Amino acid sequence: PTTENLYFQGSMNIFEMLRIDEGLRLKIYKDCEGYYTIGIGHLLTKSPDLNAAKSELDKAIGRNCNGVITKDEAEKLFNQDVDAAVRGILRNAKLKPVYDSLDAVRRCAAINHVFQMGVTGVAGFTNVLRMLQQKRWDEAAVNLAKSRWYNQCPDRAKRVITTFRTGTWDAYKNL
Ligand SMILES: O=[N+]([O-])c1ccc(O)cc1
Ligand SMILES: O=[N+]([O-])c1ccc(O)cc1
């Protein structure tokens, strides 16, 4: 690796990772699963009603957005969502010990998955959690590749599953 390459891990962190996986959109859009989203992967609602999505948005931002936010607002909301994912893992008796056992880069992949899927969905992956605690990386990654999370929307999950397999940032290079 070049000097520049060895610097690339320092440029990577959970925010930079989720920003690649989720994109940045300033207007309400439907995700790969059809669901109303804004900012950096902020899910607004499962309802098919745009007006519900807008109501959730104004609540989340605190003004009358009419479906549109600023980059600064998207970042503030993203930071709240990242904090909520981290807090969700740490207060959970099933996820905390696995997270604690992980290295820094796999801890980012853990936060990413919980941000995407939520704590209860993630904490139900009994096998994957045991495999990770036992450092069975290849098996963990194959088991995550069976999930509806990955298979319903592969592009958004593929880099996270590679990161659990390798513990490096290689999947985030060369966009
Ligand atoms: O803290 N943030 O809102 C961020 C950080 C990094 C990034 O690439 C986008 C947003
Ligand atoms: O918090 N965790 O330890 C996690 C979270 C997600 C995952 O897929 C595996 C472990």
From Swiss-Prot:
SUPFAM superfamilies: Lysozyme-like
Outcome, altering D31 to A/N/S/T: Complete loss of enzymatic activity
Impact reported for N143 to M/F: 2-fold decrease in enzymatic activity
Keyword list, A-Z: Antimicrobial, Bacteriolytic enzyme, Cytolysis, Glycosidase, Host cell lysis by virus, Host cytoplasm, Hydrolase, Viral release from host cell
Impact when changing G41F: Almost complete loss of enzymatic activity. The enzyme is destabilized by 1.5 kcal/mol
Catalytic activity: Hydrolysis of (1->4)-beta-linkages between N-acetylmuramic acid and N-acetyl-D-glucosamine residues in a peptidoglycan and between N-acetyl-D-glucosamine residues in chitodextrins
GO biological process assignments: cell wall macromolecule catabolic process; defense response to bacterium; peptidoglycan catabolic process; viral release from host cell by cytolysis
Functional pH dependence: Optimum pH is 7.3.
Record protein name field: Endolysin
Gene: E
